[PDB]
């Protein structure tokens, strides 16, 4: 045990896991990430055909302008001006709190950070998908296959000097034919290289590798070029919201050579990359309940074939029927990549051993589970839940031991509404969660190697980052014509007086008391949350949803002396490695 208050105003025993998680993640990434992988898959500029605005318009998300909104901040006299910003427009960062908001032109449905190697200090991006329409909704049973746009948004570089006056820039997007996208995952390491890397004119310095869970029931694998190399190739007269028709690196689909019968698997619904070097396997969950694995380097003429345009088609090497219904989530163990966990519409969380796929390590029945998080240091999994089957008031977020320690599920955060998305930060050891109630909640996990019942009141370990409300000055137009979004943000700089500050007193009415809206669009619903996986910007978070507005925050209270120490030591080593 350790007594006293940290200078950020949380007790030291509450923060001590958060500080420990930095060291454990650093030791892991030193050993089990890598600096370069898939050396053959460098982007080729001639595969990136820029669409004109005339060609792009069918792919563009149909909302040209955001809903009206205002932003309020704890301790700042209220602004109250109604903003309304175009598609691909960003407001400017608040000069001190650095929150940023920008409009994606539709409702946000996939989101991941581009993984930037430890110490690189690179430009920091999010790749995202936003649905073509604010009110249209797609049946799970059907291969939608309607065209849509993958988007890449540069957030600048999130360095301290850069945060004031920052903006989010829509550097480019990819026109996708293969339906709407349900999940996005980058190759967790080794894809990135320096934007200043000298390469021959057809090649472009690679930003990343990105895999898409298409509603068309297949996975698209792209290598992203750095934007500067595209803009150096692009004629300067072209439209700067550049929309590219991009040839896939590989197309991943369930089948076999000469398999005439199209697979019953239906939509792809969740991805996991193999969390450890050399990231050779990609796993996907399917509507028919299967989990499917592709070995991306595979030379074998039984798994790999090349299309006439030179893109790959990959068939899987292994599948198993993990679930009785659609696999809503995969999470792959970082500490040992033989183990994987999944959740499904049959509302069982199943822990798997991929050496022995016929029997799960453990199956725990639960409420209908929407996303899982598995933080490196902890044996168990944290579950976001739909409330439709929950014992009333016991819904929300639970951490669930894989079972050896045998603790009860730690009821980390009660929620009335269904948490749509969940994200852990391995650097922080903390988790954040987006709700239809419109709060974004973040919470600190105890040292889960010790019995969580020793936590006498978990309310001391969570805080609301913001709540989205509709203010009245069944469809999107009939909503926005009569309501505007109010975003009210906490003072993230410290957690002093937290349990007395009004956002907590408000949040304690969101828990338990809050009567759930069911009679309008749920326009405030937060569909995705992602902490940064990158040591640079490790305290940054991105969120968004039915409003189509992304909002970004810096959890200033959790960035710490060890974070600064670790960033500088990694910066020195990185600068010693690449020159």
């Amino acid at each position: 045990h350790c007594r006293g208050m940290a200078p950020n105003g949380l007790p030291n025993h509450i923060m001590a896991p958060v500080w420990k998680c930095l060291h454990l993640t650093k030791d892991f990434r030193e050993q089990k990430h890598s600096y370069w992988e898939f050396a053959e898959w460098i982007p080729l500029a001639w595969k990136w055909h820029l669409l004109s605005e005339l060609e792009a318009a069918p792919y563009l998300p149909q909302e040209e302008k955001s809903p009206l909104f205002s932003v309020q901040r704890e301790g700042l006299p209220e602004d109250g001006t109604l903003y309304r910003i175009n598609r691909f427009s960003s407001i400017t960062a608040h000069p001190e709190r650095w929150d940023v908001s920008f409009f994606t032109g539709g409702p946000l449905w996939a989101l991941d950070w581009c993984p930037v190697p430890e110490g690189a200090g690179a430009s920091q991006y999010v790749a995202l998908f936003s649905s073509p329409d604010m009110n249209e909704t797609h049946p799970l049973s059907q291969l939608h296959s309607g065209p849509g746009l993958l988007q890449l948004w540069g957030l600048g570089t999130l360095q301290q000097e850069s945060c004031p006056g920052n903006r989010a820039h829509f550097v480019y997007g990819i026109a996708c034919d293969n339906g709407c996208i349900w999940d996005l995952k980058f190759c967790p390491s080794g894809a990135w290289e320096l934007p200043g890397t000298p390469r021959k004119a057809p090649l472009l310095p690679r930003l990343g590798l990105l895999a898409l869970a298409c509603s068309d029931g297949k996975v698209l694998l792209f290598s992203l070029p750095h934007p500067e190399a595209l803009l150096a190739q692009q004629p300067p007269d072209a439209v700067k919201p550049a929309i590219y028709k991009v040839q896939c690196v590989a197309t991943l689909q369930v089948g076999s050579m000469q398999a005439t019968d199209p697979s019953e698997c239906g939509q792809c619904l969740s991805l996991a990359w193999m969390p450890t070097r050399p990231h050779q396997h990609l796993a996907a969950g399917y509507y028919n309940g299967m989990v499917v694995f592709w070995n991306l380097p595979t030379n074998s003429p039984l798994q790999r074939i090349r299309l006439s345009d030179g893109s790959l088609k990959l068939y899987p090497f292994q599948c198993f029927l993990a679930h009785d219904q659609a696999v809503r989530t995969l999470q792959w163990c970082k500490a040992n990549s033989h183990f994987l966990v999944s959740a499904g519409s049959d509302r069982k969380i199943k822990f798997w051993d991929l050496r022995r796929p016929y029997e799960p390590i453990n199956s725990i029945k639960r409420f209908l589970s929407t996303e899982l998080a598995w933080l490196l240091p902890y044996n168990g999994v944290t579950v976001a839940q739909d409330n439709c089957y929950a014992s009333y008031g016991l819904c929300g977020i639970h951490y669930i031991d894989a079972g050896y320690l045998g603790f009860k599920a730690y009821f980390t955060a009660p929620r009335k509404g269904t948490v749509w998305s969940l994200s852990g930060s391995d650097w922080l050891g903390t988790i954040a969660a987006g709700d239809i109630s419109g709060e974004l909640i973040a919470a600190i996990l105890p040292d889960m190697a010790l019995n969580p019942i020793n936590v006498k009141r978990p309310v001391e370990r969570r805080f609301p980052i913001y709540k989205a409300d509709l203010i009245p000055y069944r469809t999107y137009t009939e909503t926005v014509n009569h309501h505007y979004l109010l975003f009210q943000d906490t003072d993230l700089g410290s957690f002093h007086d937290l349990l007395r500050r009004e956002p907590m007193l408000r949040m304690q009415e969101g828990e338990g008391h809050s009567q759930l809206c069911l009679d309008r669009l749920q326009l405030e619903a937060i569909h995705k949350v992602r902490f940064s996986p990158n040591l640079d910007s490790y305290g940054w978070l991105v969120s968004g949803g039915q409003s189509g507005l992304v909002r970004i925050h810096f959890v200033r209270g959790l960035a710490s002396p060890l974070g600064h120490r670790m960033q500088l030591e990694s910066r020195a080593h990185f600068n010693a490695m690449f020159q």
């Binding site: 409702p107 449905w109 649905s131 909704t137 797609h138 049946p139 799970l140 049973s141 059907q142 349900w182 519409s345 209908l368 739909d386 409330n387 439709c388 089957y389 009333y392 269904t418 239809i436 009567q515 759930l516 069911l518 009679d519 749920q522």
Partner: protein, 308 residues
Amino acid sequence: MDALESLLDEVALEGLDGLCLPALWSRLETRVPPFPLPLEPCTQEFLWRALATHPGISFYEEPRERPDLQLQDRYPIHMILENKDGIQGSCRYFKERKNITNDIRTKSLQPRCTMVEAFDRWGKKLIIVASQAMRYRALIGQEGDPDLKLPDFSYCILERLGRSRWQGELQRDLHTTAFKVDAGKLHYHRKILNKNGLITMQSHVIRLPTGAQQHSILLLLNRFHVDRRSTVPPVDIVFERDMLTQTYDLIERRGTKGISQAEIRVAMNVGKLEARMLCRLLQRFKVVKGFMEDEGRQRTTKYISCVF
């Protein structure tokens, strides 16, 4: 069939209360088909030695000399429940009778007593009982599944029917007199036996000593059966909406005509309790209200959203 097979079958067709020796002789005498071996003192000793030498056969001293069997052509039940060894059936003295197996036979099952020695020593206190596997097999027959585990009430139904052999039992008398329960309570516990198919339903007519005649259901175990003469369309769950939102929208699409919980279940493709939770939550958020409607046998509930 083998004589010694039929010997064990007659023992195993009684329940956990088993047979006394005179009851066994009575059962062998009353057997259909006829017992192949004529009963004689040498036979009764020989059959006693066969029973004594059988490892699954077991022996008890009952606290009372049991009354002999009535001729069954046309027992007090004492159900043993949730037994931790998993043995099932009825036996009034189950906790009060004592095993005398090691006294009747060695560990090598060699008989320590003759039939007349044992019957002199104990009379109708001597009970022969077949082990749980033997008794259950005699109820199942060969073709049913030993992996089946029944509710103990439903096993007691079989054990009553099993000992009743070709004569069977009337569902009237089972609920009225044996189990002393309402017909629905028996019927509910009988339905599983029809579902797994262990028993047969016979329409039967009682003729009273008053001269009137009355219908009843005869029940017979399969071994002994002999026929006596005389629009809402379903919802494909969408990705982008939670299950409450999707279920409320269904009810609002139904509106004033409403929908039942059963039709919610069918339309949502969910389990019974899962549909029950969805209804109760939408009631508890007071976005939906339930209204009663007498349909068929029951006042069903149909649900309407508070917009209507």
